Amino acid sequence: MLQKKIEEEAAKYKYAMLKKCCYDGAYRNDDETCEERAARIKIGPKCVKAFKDCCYIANQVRAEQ
């Protein structure tokens, strides 16, 4: 489900800001609480969704590397 939601936002690359909300979740160099920062990233419902699923995969690969 999580990877499928990344794919449904980051497939439709015409929706540039919303897949870049994904990629705002994917720059996991903060290591603290990304959902408090995406309480501040309030740009749209799809933006928080892209951000949250990308942050979860990014956090779980950061827990590995």
From Swiss-Prot:
**Residues covered by the Anaphylatoxin-like domain:** 21-55
Annotated Gene Ontology cellular components are:
extracellular region
Renumbered to this chain, region (Involved in C5AR1 binding) spans 15-44
SMART domains tied to this protein: ANATO
Sorted keywords for this record are: Complement alternate pathway, Complement pathway, Disulfide bond, Immunity, Inflammatory response, Innate immunity, Secreted
The organism's superkingdom is given as Eukaryota
Supply the InterPro entries for this chain: Anaphylatoxin/fibulin, Anaphylatoxin_comp_syst, Anaphylatoxn_comp_syst_dom
Q: Which PROSITE patterns match?
A: ANAPHYLATOXIN_1, ANAPHYLATOXIN_2
Identify the main location: secreted
Disulfide cross-links: 21-47, 22-54, 34-55
Q: Where in the cell is it found?
A: Secreted
Reply yes or no: does the keyword Secreted apply: yes
Q: What is the documented function of this protein? A: Mediator of local inflammatory process released following cleavage by C5 convertase. Acts by binding to its receptor (C5AR1 or C5AR2), activating G protein-coupled receptor signaling and inducing a variety of responses including intracellular calcium release, contraction of smooth muscle, increased vascular permeability, and histamine release from mast cells and basophilic leukocytes. C5a is also a potent chemokine which stimulates the locomotion of polymorphonuclear leukocytes and directs their migration toward sites of inflammation.
What's the protein here called? Complement C5a anaphylatoxin
Biological source species? Sus scrofa (Pig)
* Gene name of the record: C5
